[PDB]
């Protein structure tokens, strides 16, 4: 599914993740813009081997388990595919624990190179929340 950028806003709100850790839902809409363009389906293979899914772009190597990436940890505890669906349950629960990580939400590359230290208001702005 690809999300219009006030409906992900606001699913994300439902799901707890404004604010979440410090970090406002303009930092997480910002994040889901760069990393996926808002899709769901979104797949990106890494040269280590692993690869990144969903509209968060999460980590094989560490989080989930697409049973393709050996030396996995699945941190989450779900087969990577469940991260794709057009639910956003998975992708927001597991999300929550790579931020609270110690490294905040500078695990997320695109974040840490499009979002970090811009207005990041921008991105909800005219949204009905």
Same mark, same amino acid.
């Given at each position: ?38 899709? =769901? ?27 393709? =990436? ?18 956003? =349950? ?40």
């Amino acid at each position: 599914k690809v999300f219009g950028r006030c409906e992900l806003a606001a699913a994300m709100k439902r799901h707890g993740l404004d604010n979440y850790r410090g970090y406002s839902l303009g930092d997480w809409v910002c994040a889901a813009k760069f990393e996926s363009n808002f899709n =769901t389906q979104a797949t990106n293979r890494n040269t280590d081997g692993s690869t990144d899914y969903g509209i968060l772009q999460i980590n094989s190597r560490w989080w989930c388990n697409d049973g393709r =990436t050996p030396g996995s940890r699945n941190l989450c505890n779900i087969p990577c595919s469940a991260l794709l669906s057009s639910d956003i =349950t998975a992708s927001v629960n597991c999300a929550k624990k790579i931020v609270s990580d110690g490294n905040g939400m500078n695990a997320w590359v695109a974040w840490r190179n499009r979002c970090k230290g811009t207005d990041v208001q921008a991105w909800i702005r005219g949204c009905r929340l």
